Amino acid sequence: KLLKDLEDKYRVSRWQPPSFKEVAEELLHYLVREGVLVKINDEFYWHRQALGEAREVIKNLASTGPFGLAEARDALGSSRKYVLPLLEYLDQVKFTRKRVVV
Amino acid sequence: SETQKKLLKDLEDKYRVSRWQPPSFKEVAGSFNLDPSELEELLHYLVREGVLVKINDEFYWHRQALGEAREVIKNLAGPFGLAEARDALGSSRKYVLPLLEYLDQVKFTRRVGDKRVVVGN
Amino acid sequence: GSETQKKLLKDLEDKYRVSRWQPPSFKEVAGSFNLDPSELEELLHYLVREGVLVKINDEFYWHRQALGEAREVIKNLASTGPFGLAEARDALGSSRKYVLPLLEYLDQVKFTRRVGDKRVVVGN
Amino acid sequence: GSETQKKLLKDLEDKYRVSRWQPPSFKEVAGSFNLDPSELEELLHYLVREGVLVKINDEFYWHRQALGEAREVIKNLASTGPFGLAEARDALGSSRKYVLPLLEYLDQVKFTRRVGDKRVVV
RNA sequence: GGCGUUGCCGGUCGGCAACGCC
RNA sequence: GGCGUUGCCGGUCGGCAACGCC
RNA sequence: GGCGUUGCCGGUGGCAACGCC
16 A cells, blocks of 8 residues: 555656655565656655656657757756756766756 | 657656645746647657546646555545545545546545545555 | 062963963963962953953953054944944954953943844944 | 934944054955045045054054054053064964064154064163 | 754854754 | 965064965 | 754855854
């Protein structure tokens, strides 16, 4: 039950997920290990599906050249707040590196 | 036909990013700039293929968005009201009312009383 | 008590004359001259009697001249209307730690009067 | 206004009273009060004439009270022998830039006398 | 995080920053 | 490197450090 | 006026809630 609600909370929120405090490790780590969630930073986690088409959006954007944080925010319709961590997470996992999709 | 097939994936991603607040027919007509029942030749083709799903006359939901909405609705259930469901997805009657009518028609959720119940099929 | 004790009175006075509007506290003075409280307390009281220092509060003594000058600055600031602690501080280029004790002292000798959170100069 | 000019004179004085032993230069005062040399020069002379300020050199004027106190500090410092410029700077807690002009001024009105690289209060 | 000391700020019993310690 | 402005230092016409320019 | 919390913004401070003083 608590694992289903945790999942929905992130799924419903999508590209603008709640922070650890807002939702407030035992459970989250489990979902991460189950492919349900993925850690972007110490702050908040993202639903993998949400992270999925969110990545698909970034990819379809960099098609027409580089792109800064501002541009990223527009396509995802989020805010520099949530878009900056996400984009940094992508530089990490090597999805990108303005920015370019490598 | 490059400037033709690129309009199909173009619309798909449009409904893809819109998720639970899908753009209406009338609305998408101007966003891409295309005739009335002419956009139909695009929407319906994607419809038959299954990429888009028609909930009502006004708008369609991308294949996935429906799946996920159905997942959140599956969690929400014993019984639930339209308000509880609207909060479950954090949406408005504008879209939720139509989606629930759809889910009734496809026998996903049945209206047992003034509330619906996700039929465990 | 000889003549080197007399130089001590001079070096003490100068400590206050130089420090001016940010006078050293009893503790700092004791430390600077390496004095026992009892010695310092009597030296200060002597300087007060001789009209060299004026006691603002148990912590701070002010050189009489420093005080007189601060009163002139405050008098001019008070010309345009009542004034708050912050303006007195800006006017003196000092800090709250040093200015509040001066203003409380001035209210006490009735040079100024605090009404609300402002003061007005009544004296000369 | 007249009372407006009167206030301006109180603010010039205050500027010198507050700054004491590190008085602002002519240039600095002009910029602060947004005055033209012509005006500042006459205002200062008024102040000197009024016994409020004392000209130390061409850049520096000192408040009369700040000068008297610096003299007192120098007197006690020289009580135990000739003193150098650096010793004067330490006793006053100032800097060479402000102290040397003061000492040259004091030699001038003969308060002190320089002999070699040291001074004595006459 | 907690405690303390100091400084500056805002009238005043707080806020900010050193530093000490747990 | 060169020139320059400023500040502190050393009696004074130089040392140190910002800063500006070349 | 001091300060703090939060949101948006511009890649790293600006505007604006709300709050304490």
